[PDB]
Amino acid sequence: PIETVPVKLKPGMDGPKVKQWPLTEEKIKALVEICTEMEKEGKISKIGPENPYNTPVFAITKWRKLVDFRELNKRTQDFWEVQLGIPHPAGLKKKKSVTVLDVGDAYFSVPLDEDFRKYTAFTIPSINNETPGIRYQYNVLPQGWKGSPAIFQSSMTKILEPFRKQNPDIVIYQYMDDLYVGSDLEIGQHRTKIEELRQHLLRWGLTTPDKKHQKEPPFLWMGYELHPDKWTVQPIVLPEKDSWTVNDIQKLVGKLNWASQIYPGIKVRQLCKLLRGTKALTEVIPLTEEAELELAENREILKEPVHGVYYDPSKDLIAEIQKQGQGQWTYQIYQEPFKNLKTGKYARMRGAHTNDVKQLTEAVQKITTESIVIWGKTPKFKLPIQKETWETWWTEYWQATWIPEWEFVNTPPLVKLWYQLEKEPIVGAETFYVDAGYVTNRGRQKVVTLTDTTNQKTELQAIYLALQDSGLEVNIVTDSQYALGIIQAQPDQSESELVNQIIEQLIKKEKVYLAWVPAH
Amino acid sequence: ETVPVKLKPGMDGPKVKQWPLTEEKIKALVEICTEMEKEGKISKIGPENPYNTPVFAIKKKDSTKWRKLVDFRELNKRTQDFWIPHPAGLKKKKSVTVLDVGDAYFSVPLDEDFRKYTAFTIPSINNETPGIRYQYNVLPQGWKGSPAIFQSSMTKILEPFRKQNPDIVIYQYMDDLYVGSDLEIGQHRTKIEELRQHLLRWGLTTPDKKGYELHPDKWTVQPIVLPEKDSWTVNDIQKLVGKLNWASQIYPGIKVRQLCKLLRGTKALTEVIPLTEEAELELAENREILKEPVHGVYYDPSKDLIAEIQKQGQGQWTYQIYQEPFKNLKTGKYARTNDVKQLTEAVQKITTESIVIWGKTPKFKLPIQKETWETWWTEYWQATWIPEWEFVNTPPLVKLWYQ
Numbered sequence: 071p072i073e074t075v076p077v078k079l080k081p082g083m084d085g086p087k088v089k090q091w092p093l094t095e096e097k098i099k100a101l102v103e104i105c106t107e108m109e110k111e112g113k114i115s116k117i118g119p120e121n122p123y124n125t126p127v128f129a130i131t132k133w134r135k136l137v138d139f140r141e142l143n144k145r146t147q148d149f150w151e152v153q154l155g156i157p158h159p160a161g162l163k164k165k166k167s168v169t170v171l172d173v174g175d176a177y178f179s180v181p182l183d184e185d186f187r188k189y190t191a192f193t194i195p196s197i198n199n200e201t202p203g204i205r206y207q208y209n210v211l212p213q214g215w216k217g218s219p220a221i222f223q224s225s226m227t228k229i230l231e232p233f234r235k236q237n238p239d240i241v242i243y244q245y246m247d248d249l250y251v252g253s254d255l256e257i258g259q260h261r262t263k264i265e266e267l268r269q270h271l272l273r274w275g276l277t278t279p280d281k282k283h284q285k286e287p288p289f290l291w292m293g294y295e296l297h298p299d300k301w302t303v304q305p306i307v308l309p310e311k312d313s314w315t316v317n318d319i320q321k322l323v324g325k326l327n328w329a330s331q332i333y334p335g336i337k338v339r340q341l342c343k344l345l346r347g348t349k350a351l352t353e354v355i356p357l358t359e360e361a362e363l364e365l366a367e368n369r370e371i372l373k374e375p376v377h378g379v380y381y382d383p384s385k386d387l388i389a390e391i392q393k394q395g396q397g398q399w400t401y402q403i404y405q406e407p408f409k410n411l412k413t414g415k416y417a418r419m420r421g422a423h424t425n426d427v428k429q430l431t432e433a434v435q436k437i438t439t440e441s442i443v444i445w446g447k448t449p450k451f452k453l454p455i456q457k458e459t460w461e462t463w464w465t466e467y468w469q470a471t472w473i474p475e476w477e478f479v480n481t482p483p484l485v486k487l488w489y490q491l492e493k494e495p496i497v498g499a500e501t502f503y504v505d506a507g508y509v510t511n512r513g514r515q516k517v518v519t520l521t522d523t524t525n526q527k528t529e530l531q532a533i534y535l536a537l538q539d540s541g542l543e544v545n546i547v548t549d550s551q552y553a554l555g556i557i558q559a560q561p562d563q564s565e566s567e568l569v570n571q572i573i574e575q576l577i578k579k580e581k582v583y584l585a586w587v588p589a590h
Numbered sequence: 591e592t593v594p595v596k597l598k599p600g601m602d603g604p605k606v607k608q609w610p611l612t613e614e615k616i617k618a619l620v621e622i623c624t625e626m627e628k629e630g631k632i633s634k635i636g637p638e639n640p641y642n643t644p645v646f647a648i649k650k651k652d653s654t655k656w657r658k659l660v661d662f663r664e665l666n667k668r669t670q671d672f673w674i675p676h677p678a679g680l681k682k683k684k685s686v687t688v689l690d691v692g693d694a695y696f697s698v699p700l701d702e703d704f705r706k707y708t709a710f711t712i713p714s715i716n717n718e719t720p721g722i723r724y725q726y727n728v729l730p731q732g733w734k735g736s737p738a739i740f741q742s743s744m745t746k747i748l749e750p751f752r753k754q755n756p757d758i759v760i761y762q763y764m765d766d767l768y769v770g771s772d773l774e775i776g777q778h779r780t781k782i783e784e785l786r787q788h789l790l791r792w793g794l795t796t797p798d799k800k801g802y803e804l805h806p807d808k809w810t811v812q813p814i815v816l817p818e819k820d821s822w823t824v825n826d827i828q829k830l831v832g833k834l835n836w837a838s839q840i841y842p843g844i845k846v847r848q849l850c851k852l853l854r855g856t857k858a859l860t861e862v863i864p865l866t867e868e869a870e871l872e873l874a875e876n877r878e879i880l881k882e883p884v885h886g887v888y889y890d891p892s893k894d895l896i897a898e899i900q901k902q903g904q905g906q907w908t909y910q911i912y913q914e915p916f917k918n919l920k921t922g923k924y925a926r927t928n929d930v931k932q933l934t935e936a937v938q939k940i941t942t943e944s945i946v947i948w949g950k951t952p953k954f955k956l957p958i959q960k961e962t963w964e965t966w967w968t969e970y971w972q973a974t975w976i977p978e979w980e981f982v983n984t985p986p987l988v989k990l991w992y993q
């Protein structure tokens with residue numbers, strides 16, 4: 071039927087010459103039957119002992135022929151990656167009706183590069199010992215071989231190609247041995263095209279199940295539950311118990327996460343806290359009062375089904391973003407007011423310290439990136455930030471950045487800049503020279519020496535001290551380019567406590583001028 | 591008719607991940623490629639071909655058509671070297687116009703055993719389809735081998751116009767053609783257009799680009815500067831001493847002893863300090879030392895060209911082209927649109943200058959997050975080449991010492 075895909079071994083390498091394991095006469099028997107039916111169908115063919123190559127085989131009444139091609143595969147060229155990523159459901163279009171077609175005898179319908187067959191040679195032992203065994207070789211795509219998946223996919227799409235142009239209404243997504251066919255056709259006309267397809271495939275030896283022997287919606291797929299006009303995630307059930315093991319908690323969190331893409335409100339902050347210090351996947355962690363509350367809240371949220379709507383090219387994509395806790399963002403992408411195509415969370419803490427502006431901006435990128443991936447275009451953004459505030463940070467920051475069309479949305483908590491460094495020294499404000507203590511222009515000083523502290527950490531401490539003892543307005547002079555940079559980036563949150571302490575001071579001051587000067 | 595090109599010994603073909611594209615661009619590439627296929631420039635390929643090079647679609651400024659841009663960067667680094675030396679005269683021309691002689695490669699076939707390596711893919715939205723894959727049959731635009739292999743036919747196809755009016759210095763870098771001269775702005779665009787027809791009578795319709803001209807003759811370096819303050823506060827001086835101290839790394843002649851003295855004890859920042867004859871003279875010297883680039887900075891062709899860029903805010907940027915730290919071969923600036931649009935315009939601007947001056951593109955160090963650059967750079971980029979680049983987090987210290 072189809073033209074063959076030329077194949078070659080990896081360079082330098084030669085075909086496999088691996089020993090055929092001993093086989094029971096019952097195994098020998100079952101195999102000769104299976105192998106004679108396959109020679110009757112042409113899948114394989116008998117060859118003479120001139121072929122020095124060989125792949126091991128075995129059998130696993132119920133009998134089946136399993137050929138071990140791992141060795142050959144080690145020697146077989148690399149092929150173009152069989153379908154890398156898979157379409158997120160939020161990116162599919164709404165269909166009136168859809169039919170999934172399972173393709174049987176898939177690989178058993180595509181010839182094999184003649185020039186390559188010899189390399190797939192294998193041998194089944196003859197019952198009588200005096201006599202030699204039978205040597206065959208595949209003429210089709212051998213289940214288990216390296217290129218089969220890719221060579222098959224290729225062919226398929228080459229086969230669907232025509233039918234497709236003759237049916238511009240119908241949408242077909244190919245996935246492994248499945249064939250998802252959808253349309254906006256009336257129930258009757260749909261089942262007809264489907265049968266058309268089924269024959270267009272049969273025409274090349276491709277066999278699929280008929281109308282009664284076909285799976286019907288919703289299609290549970292790759293962790294989702296797909297309807298023709300809507301989707302959702304596979305049903306999620308939060309176990310009930312009083313003894314949670316570290317492993318238990320991890321799986322719970324994992325599940326909880328897979329849900330955020332549709333269920334808004336899911337939180338894991340507290341359940342994740344339970345993993346601190348854990349010493350074995352089988353260690354038991356009692357649920358804190360906050361964790362119990364979280365679980366309960368998620369149970370409830372999960373209790374009532376939610377569902378994602380499909381992409382409607384006609385309309386615009388809107389992405390809305392909110393802050394739901396320090397370093398915690400939530401967003402949703404819709405086209406029609408509140409009809410969510412998809413939702414999600416972002417907690418990515420990029421860098422040791424940041425602020426809501428940098429973070430928020432980083433969320434736009436992720437969202438933007440996945441939007442282009444799922445829909446091919448970027449969504450208009452509705453952000454809890456004012457354009458003035460963004461631009462303030464914009465120009466200040468030494469790093470370039472861009473945010474597509476977006477409109478401010480007055481939905482607390484609005485993201486802001488809790489403090490800003492005066493660009494010029496303050497007249498009349500005391501001056502603190504810091505190097506682990508400090509000296510002011512007003513004669514004041516305090517040299518403290520702390521136990522257990524990094525050099526980098528000793529600096530911030532001094533600056534900290536300085537802030538603590540200073541009035542509402544203060545000028546600070548450090549030789550630490552580090553702390554300078556840190557504070558200069560105007561963080562509002564830090565993993566370090568010191569920082570946070572300092573940030574507290576900054577927010578409190580009326581005016582702070584930070585200056586750097588080389589040491590020594 | 592094909593010339594046997596190979597890869598550097600032992601190297602395999604590129605397998606570069608294709609960055610997600612927008613439906614707008616993809617469609618553009620579909621039309622484009624469906625036509626290159628129709629013309630046998632490219633051909634659909636099968637699964638036995640595991641290679642890949644990223645492809646993109648950029649627009650031609652003041653032109654309605656889209657352009658397929660292929661990131662052969664990975665490939666070009668793995669392609670066998672080929673054994674005209676860069677003209678030190680071009681940089682000295684009054685005006686250089688840049689042309690897109692890319693369509694010229696479209697005739698020369700590509701050695702069939704090398705074709706597989708030029709494989710690329712047109713992604714599909716949401717992976718709802720496997721995505722269209724092709725390879726080239728003719729010399730591809732952007733591939734290092736193309737200009738080389740076509741070196742010959744070019745020399746010939748240019749030999750007449752070359753010696754006809756040799757008062758012009760023509761130069762080829764990849765798909766581009768840099769045409770320099772000293773004609774008057776009018777007499778230039780004239781003989782400039784003529785070359786365009788002389789080439790039409792040989793291969794492509796060849797459109798110029800950036801349609802404007804460069805004026806290398808006027809490219810001036812940006813020396814380190816110092817605040818010309820009327821009165822000097824303790825702060826002013828500190829920023830001064832500091833900047834100086836940093837610039838001493840490059841100019842050993844610089845001194846601050848007298849300036850540092852003006853900063854005795856624990857003085858209040860805003861305290862205005864009057865400058866002392868001694869120091870005042872020391873400053874003027876330093877200032878005088880900075881009036882020009884540090885001596886002994888020669889371009890070593892065996893080394894790569896690095897280009898760092900900084901954001902000074904206000905839509906203004908500073909850059910430095912060098913090979914060895916503190917030994918910059920050049921510096922300048924760019925002014926304003928948004929942050930990304932500006933950076934690309936700069937990168938491209940700096941690369942063009944680099945090509946004219948050294949006939950080589952530099953390795954950039956961009957102050958941006960990869961994912962952001964990857965997302966928008968193709969939005970304003972219009973050059974036919976793509977420099978190598980990296981992503982850094984510049985210290986607001988070095989940014990406080992330029993411009």
Ligand SMILES: O=C1Nc2ccc(Cl)cc2[C@@](C#CC2CC2)(C(F)(F)F)O1
Binds near residue numbers: 251
């Ligand atoms: O674009 C659409 N619309 C759609 C709507 C409902 C369902 Cl259940 C399936 C689809 C579909 C698909 C698919 C595979 C990914 C699952 C189909 F191709 F139509 F089959 O892609």
